């Protein structure tokens, strides 16, 4: 199977939100805070 059990590959889908474009879109995808304890 997959590496993602559930349906596909990796949060439900990819090149949608922050992985598979990562030179600037994860960095747009980290829009601000709430998202870990290091911020």
Same mark, same amino acid.
């Given at each position: 199977?997959? @590496?993602?059990?559930?349906?596909? &590959? %990796?949060?439900?889908? @990819? +090149? %949608?939100? !922050?992985?598979?474009?990562i @030179? %600037?879109?994860? +960095?747009?995808? &980290?829009?601000?805070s709430?998202? %870990? !304890?290091?911020?």
């Open positions: 199977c997959p @590496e993602e059990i559930r349906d596909q &590959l %990796l949060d439900f889908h @990819e +090149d %949608l939100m !922050t992985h598979c474009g @030179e %600037l879109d994860e +960095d747009g995808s &980290l829009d601000g709430n998202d %870990l !304890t290091i911020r």
